[PDB]
Amino acid sequence: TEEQIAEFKEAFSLFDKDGDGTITTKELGTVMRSLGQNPTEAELQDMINEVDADGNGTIDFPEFLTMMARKMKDTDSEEEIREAFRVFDKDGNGYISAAELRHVMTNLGEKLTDEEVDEMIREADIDGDGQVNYEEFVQMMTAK
């Protein structure tokens, strides 16, 4: 559908750093390292090779579309926010705590301080219970 092709182009545009229409191992590695991952050049080759269809060793948008159609057909901004909240809420009590947000930041390669964590929880925490529930998270996350 048109909504999800739009979705997947936006995603592709996050990886295609130079806007040349192809994702390279250099660009995929740059993205993965920004997420606090440490891939080898071999892991990056294996990932590009699974998605590559013409054996040129880079991913164009049609190849990326085929991957997303096989692996993520249903994702929307809404399903993405629900999934992120489930991943962030480590103990599954329906609230993100300061300690859970610290864990998430470390897991995604985001430098943190306790003052930043406190400010983030306080700004998202609409009801003032001290933690961020799903309604609060959606309010914070709807705008890019």
Binding site: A11, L14, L28, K71, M72, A84, E110, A124, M141, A143
Partner: peptide, 21 residues
């Protein structure tokens, strides 16, 4: 800062896409 919340959601979205390769 709302920018950092937005940035974490975006990082999680890109992690999910990386996982598809």
């Amino acid at each position: 800062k709302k920018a950092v919340w937005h940035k974490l959601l975006s990082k999680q979205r890109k992690r999910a896409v990386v996982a598809c390769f």
